């Protein structure tokens, strides 16, 4: 009987909540009071990158912390040289409605996708001087939202069909299909070990999946709106969640509950991109008020404001070594921020 | 700079020329978005001129791009901001769906949300009330009382069609800055492409005055 099963679901939810309360001894705010505050952090732009003729929707850093890839609505992917502000490549796209981009760890391939429900993958190390597409991944019903590279043969893709999937390069088939999300998922972040990933959906829930098997290990709730971005903590057992409301939540995999909430009354705009620092002490989150806010990951106190864009910031990026922060917005401008 | 550094710099400048050429060419193409509700005459006007289908046609030496997002089957508000800034929005609403909760109430609800959307606070809306031939054979027996209960007119097509058009005209609160164009088309109609050209002509005029700083 469906009614009995529905009632049993509430009982299981109550048991999980009771277990979470039992393991909740103290709060991170109480333990962090004795540590020295970070203070005020001043960030100044160093290199500004121009050439895009439309709003920038995605931007991913390379492994060498020098090459940068950005996607725009003009239908072109530009490989930027951060150090010298140069265009290594300009990959035309058959569809000018992309909203995601990815950089392979080896740098040989660059992936993109959008409303065409195709995750095109382009080869950058061709014998010829041009960038040629390698494989067109088809099988998703909803719009492409995010794509991440685990290796040169497997890519994890999250679409708008409330279903994530893991693809293969040699064969355009879905090796593993992830199901369980009741709403649209518009972001995805991969763990450093390339074994688990967290997807933020429209039902204000973050789900942790395993690549090898495909079932949901844990589920995280607490938000009141659709989650637009998510990013794994440097350590590996935590992640930061940003939603359409004006708050950011940090969840711990081992605790399986919310740790600390970053919010203020002066902010009434959502977060479009969430990123961390190399040491994990600094939390950087974009906002729709044309400003990027730097949050303390341990004290929930603001450290600095990155206000250099005249349009909404859509993507955020921190290099592997943590020596630079790249911020992209809808003003077709890319900026790199660093301390002094 | 070194020998290879200068070559890399020159290569970037060559891409800049290509980007500028592509951007200038793309700026001369009028972008149109098709938002038919449940295939309500959406496919009967494409021939008269995969997730997204792009239709390209030229009228009066003007390039037109038509985008169909009826097959997305996802959340509308997650990608409705990508089409912000289009020249005009083409809306297709059937007229024979009043008899068939109701198929036009969904169209009215869908029209209300997009017309009042933040990203489309100034984009022109081109309503296409097609399937008017079937309206003649359906209004004789089935009246408009089933669809609209607050109807006092007769069963004549002249006044009943205006009532349906009127109900789609007071669904926008920003009447002082956004204007909705309405037309009654059919399968045999051949002037539908002409109406779109006149509709986008006004938008170009407003953009032309914006560029010169007059408005």
């Amino acid at each position, epitope marked *: 009987e469906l009614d009995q099963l529905r009632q049993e679901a509430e009982q299981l939810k109550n048991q999980i909540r009771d277990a979470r309360k039992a393991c909740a001894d103290a709060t991170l705010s109480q333990i962090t009071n004795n540590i020295d505050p970070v203070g005020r952090i001043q960030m100044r732009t160093r290199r500004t990158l121009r050439g895009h003729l439309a709003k920038i929707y995605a931007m991913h850093w390379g492994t060498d912390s020098r090459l940068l890839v950005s996607a725009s609505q003009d239908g072109k992917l530009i490989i930027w040289d951060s150090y010298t502000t140069n265009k290594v490549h300009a990959i035309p796209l058959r569809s000018s409605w992309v909203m995601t981009c990815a950089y392979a760890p080896s740098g040989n391939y660059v992936a993109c996708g959008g409303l065409d429900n195709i995750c095109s993958i382009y080869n950058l190390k061709t*014998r*010829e001087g*041009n960038v040629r597409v390698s494989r067109e991944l088809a099988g998703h019903t909803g719009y492409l939202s995010c794509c991440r590279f685990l290796d040169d043969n497997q890519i994890v893709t999250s679409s708008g069909d409330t279903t994530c999937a893991l693809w293969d390069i040699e064969t355009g088939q879905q090796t593993t299909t992830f199901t369980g999300h009741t709403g649209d998922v518009m972001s995805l972040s991969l763990a450093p070990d390339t074994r688990l990933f967290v997807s933020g959906a429209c039902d204000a829930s973050a789900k942790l999946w395993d690549v090898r098997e495909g079932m949901c290990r844990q589920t995280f709730t607490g938000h009141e709106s659709d989650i637009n971005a998510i990013c794994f903590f440097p350590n590996g057992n935590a992640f930061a969640t940003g939603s359409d409301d004006a708050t950011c939540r940090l969840f711990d995999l081992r605790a399986d509950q919310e740790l600390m909430t970053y919010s203020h009354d002066n902010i009434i705009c959502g977060i479009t991109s969430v990123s961390f620092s190399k040491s994990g002490r600094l939390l950087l989150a974009g906002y729709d008020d044309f400003n990027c806010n730097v949050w303390d990951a341990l004290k929930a106190d603001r450290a600095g404001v990155l206000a250099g864009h005249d349009n909404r910031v859509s993507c955020l990026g921190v290099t592997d070594d943590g020596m630079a922060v790249a911020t992209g917005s809808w003003d077709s401008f890319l900026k790199i921020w660093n301390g002094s | 700079l*070194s020998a*290879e550094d200068k*070559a890399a710099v020159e290569r970037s400048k060559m891409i800049d020329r290509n980007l500028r050429e592509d951007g200038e060419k793309a700026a001369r193409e009028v972008k149109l978005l098709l938002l038919g509700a449940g295939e309500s005459g959406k496919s009967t006007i494409v021939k008269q001129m995969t997730g997204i289908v792009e239709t390209h046609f030229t009228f009066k030496d003007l390039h037109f791009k038509m985008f169909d997002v009826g097959g997305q089957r996802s959340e509308r508000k997650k990608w409705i901001h990508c089409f912000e800034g289009v020249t005009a929005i083409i809306f297709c609403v059937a007229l024979s769906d009043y008899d068939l909760m109701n198929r036009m109430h969904e169209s009215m609800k869908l029209f209300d949300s997009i017309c009042n959307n933040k990203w489309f606070t100034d984009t022109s809306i081109i309503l296409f009330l097609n399937k008017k031939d079937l309206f003649e054979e359906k209004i004789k027996k089935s009246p408009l009382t089933i669809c609209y209960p607050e109807y006092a007119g007769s069963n004549t097509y002249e006044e009943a069609a205006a009532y349906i058009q009127c109900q789609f005209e007071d669904l926008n609160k920003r009447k002082d800055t956004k204007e909705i164009y309405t037309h009654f088309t059919c399968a045999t109609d051949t002037k539908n492409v002409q109406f779109v050209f006149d509709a986008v002509t006004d938008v170009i005029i407003k953009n032309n005055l914006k560029d010169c700083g007059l408005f």
Partner: single-chain antibody
Amino acid sequence: DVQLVESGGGLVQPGGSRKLSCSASGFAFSSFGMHWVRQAPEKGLEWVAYISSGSGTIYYADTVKGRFTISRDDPKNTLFLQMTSLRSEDTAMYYCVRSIYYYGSSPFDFWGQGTTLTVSSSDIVMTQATSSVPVTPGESVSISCRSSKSLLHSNGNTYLYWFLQRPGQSPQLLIYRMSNLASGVPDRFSGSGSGTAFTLTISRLEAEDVGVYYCMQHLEYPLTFGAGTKLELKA
């Protein structure tokens, strides 16, 4: 398949004119830079001219400056080298070499087959080791190289290129930027250096590894090839 075919060679009287054509097929010719390298009979390699992708950047060697002119036809995918006032010192095998900004550098990976040409009648100097080194399979061979000016730029990049010239075959690039390995090159090749002194080490030797090794610098333009080290089988 990348292919470069050179045509337009023959007997030329002194003081005459001749045009060399190098046809490019199998790759994007528009985005690829081109170079002309000539090899005199029983002598080494020397640079002649270079044309950029957009044909707006052209350089010429001091010897052939003015007399020689180079042009390209992107729609026809053909390289042109018009020569005037040919002397007896221009008798050499001309090679068309493609270049592109790749991996942060401009390698010379692909070389043309070359065409015969007989005429009947401040620069950095790269000093190489002895031009006669007897080698045997299974041994490790190190080839030394020297430069008058340090090749280490302010960006931490050293501009060195190593080429292998098989007997009767076009030269093939092995190591570029003194540390990177070209595509298709076996891992047995290693390169190292610091400023002016450079070396190339081969771990395992093979019968197909014989030939003449050349070293060139891409620091300034004015790319001077080395004297050339020849490897011969001991038996």
